[model samples]
Target: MATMQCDVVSVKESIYSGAVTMLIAKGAGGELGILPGHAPLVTLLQPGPIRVLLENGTEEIVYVSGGVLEVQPHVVTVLADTAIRADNLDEAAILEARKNAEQLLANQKSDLDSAAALAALAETAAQLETIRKIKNRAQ
Candidate 1:
């Protein structure tokens, strides 16, 4: 069996570390799928789902924000400011947060305010999308 060791860590805690047959993520350049023996890479990750497929045919979906993904010879490392499993995310809260951010970006005016609102908006939007993907996979 072919698999690569994947280590995913957030600033607050370790998200996951396991052997996965494939890693799919949204890189800065574009969405990428990394299989065993894939070329080495180091890229910025957009706020999105990082899905890892295991040998048992199950896939794990992890939502990450402002992450960096690095690929080496036999391992892949993901470092994120916030990384969480899709199952642990609260959809209603994330939806509300996105709405709040949208309101702020529409009503507030300031360099830092808009910047912060945009960042929040992006991450929440990504989280929502990740949840939808999880739904698609489940059924």
Candidate 2:
């Protein structure tokens, strides 16, 4: 099967680097499906899960918290602000964080507070959604 190099990296470290037959990710506009020989493009990625269909027919899932995505003919690079393996995410912690973000949003005293809380809320919600997606796929 035809494949392309896929690399998912964050400020801390590289989360995933391998060959994939296809990749599905959430862009700022909407979801995108990338394949080998796809048109070159660059866009802002939103906080969500990145789905990679490997050459071996296995799916690899990674959660990304906002970043940039660059697509080339033979390579797809995801430079994430933060990235985590799907299985490594903790649902309980995410729920707690989401609750805190909600409180912050509710008590928005300043623009900075609103911005920070919004970002936090989006990130935590994305993590929870990704976790749910993984669980559903597994079942």
Candidates in order: C-alpha RMSD to true structure: 2.4, 2.4
lDDT digits (tens) for residues 38-127 of candidate 1: 788999987678898887888889898867888888898888888978888789989999999999999987889999999889888888
Model 2 CA RMSD to the hidden true structure, in angstroms? 2.4
What candidate 1 gets wrong by more than 4 Å, as runs, is: 105-114
State the lDDT of candidate 2 residue by residue for 48-138, as single tens digits.
7999889998888889877999999899999889998888889999999999999999999999989999988988998888878887776
Please give the lDDT score at residue 33 for candidate 2: 93
